[model samples]
Target chain A: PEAAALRAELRDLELEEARLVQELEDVDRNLARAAADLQAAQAEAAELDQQERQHYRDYSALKRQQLELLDQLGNVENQLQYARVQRDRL
Target chain B: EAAALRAELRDLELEEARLVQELEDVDRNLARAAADLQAAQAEAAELDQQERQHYRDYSALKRQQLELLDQLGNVENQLQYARVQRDRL
Candidate 1:
């Protein structure tokens, strides 16, 4: 149509369309990189979570053993107190 | 610790050299053993071998988890930002 061609020939309209194409291209590039980063982050998080739990499991078990040793040490100190008390009694 | 040392001084003053020596030996045992337990619980040092290994492993993982969480957050933030930009455009 003659009217359609007239609008297409406008200088401002031509530049706007051209600029839009470049802007959209830039956006798509950013979007693609962001998507890739998201996937890698998820994969790394999965690996980190699994190994973290493993360490936590062992750490908790070790803490239990440590508590038991602490209990025994307190008993030894109590008995030592008794020994010193009786020995010093006049 | 100070109380134990004071007791040692008292024993010496009381002229119970042999008994004091025995108690001193027990004190030394407590000193060494208690040091390991104290260090481990404090998360300060790995005085004992077994405790050292456990803390080291757990510590490394804990720090890694935190680092990854921050990274994951950044990735998600950028993803949403990109999506919004695309949608608006």
Candidate 2:
């Protein structure tokens, strides 16, 4: 209708319609871009969570191993103490 | 010193939304993800319920089998005792 007969009213209407269409297109483009960004952010967050879970598992395993080593160390120290006492007696 | 620190903090906070414009651009997709996450959570819950049901079913089956075995053992003992008694008679 913007291309209506060259009257001031028609010209104004046509210009308004064109502006509305352009605004709509701009809005849709923004919406699409926003959706893609959000999806990307979500994917990134999921990946981070996966990494964190794996790291937690790795940390737990390391802690268990550390505990085992500490137990063995304690046993060795006890034996060392006995040996030291026996040497002192000799 | 406190007033100076407060003014510094305010300035730092102002720059934090630098990416807000970009965030606004993808608002629709974020909305979709929110909806999708709810559906995913519902699915996860259903799976959990199904797994629990399976566990309960397994327990019931095990109980039934154990009871049947106990009954069978009792029956075998009675049958042997009857044979011994008949032989004695």
Candidate 3:
């Protein structure tokens, strides 16, 4: 009588339950992957921070070297001007 | 740092989106299961009603058969009585 429809419905329910379970598994896998990616990104940011600190050190050292060179050039120019004045006066 | 965080955020976003899609799939599946369970219950009820009706019809037929048999016995008794009466006369 109605057994056929009941059997069919039971089968459909079983299929639906399987599908839901598969979907739940997919969600679990994706969450795990996202957690891994976040960890990797955190590590990368830490490395970049260290590299940026090294860049700052180099930039400061270069600036100091440029100032020292300018000071030496001024001293040399003043000595050269005095020597020329002495020669002309003699 | 912002770039790295933004990259991570993008990855997270993608994963989250995928997770949401999967969750939606799960919800639909759950709904389907519920609907199917309801259908199965309804079918079982219908089958039960049909079986009951069949039993009721069989019982009625059996009662009719018994009544007809009883009437046949009465007719045979009347024929025997009439035959004995004629023989005596």
Best by lDDT: 3
lDDT of model 2, residue B79: 51
Segments of candidate 3 deviating more than 4 angstroms: A1-7, B1-89
Task: Residues A1-90, candidate 1: write the lDDT tens digits.
Answer: 554444444444445445555555554555555555555555655555565555555555555555555565556556667656766663
Model 1 chain B: worst 10 consecutive residues (lDDT sum): B42-51
Q: How would you class the docking of model 1?
A: incorrect
Lowest lDDT sum, 10 consecutive residues, model 3 chain B, at B1-10
Tell me which of candidates 2 and 3 scores higher on TM-score.
Answer: 2
lDDT of 3 by residue, A17-38 (tens): 5554555455445545555555
Residues B1-89, candidate 3, lDDT per residue (tens digit)? 32454454455455546655655655565555555555555555555555455445545545554555555455455545544554554
TM-score of chain A of each: 0.62, 0.66, 0.61
The sequence of per-residue lDDT tens digits that candidate 2 reaches over residues A1-90 is 322322444345455556555555554555555555555555555665565555555555555555555565455556555545554554
Best-fitting candidate, scored by DockQ: 1
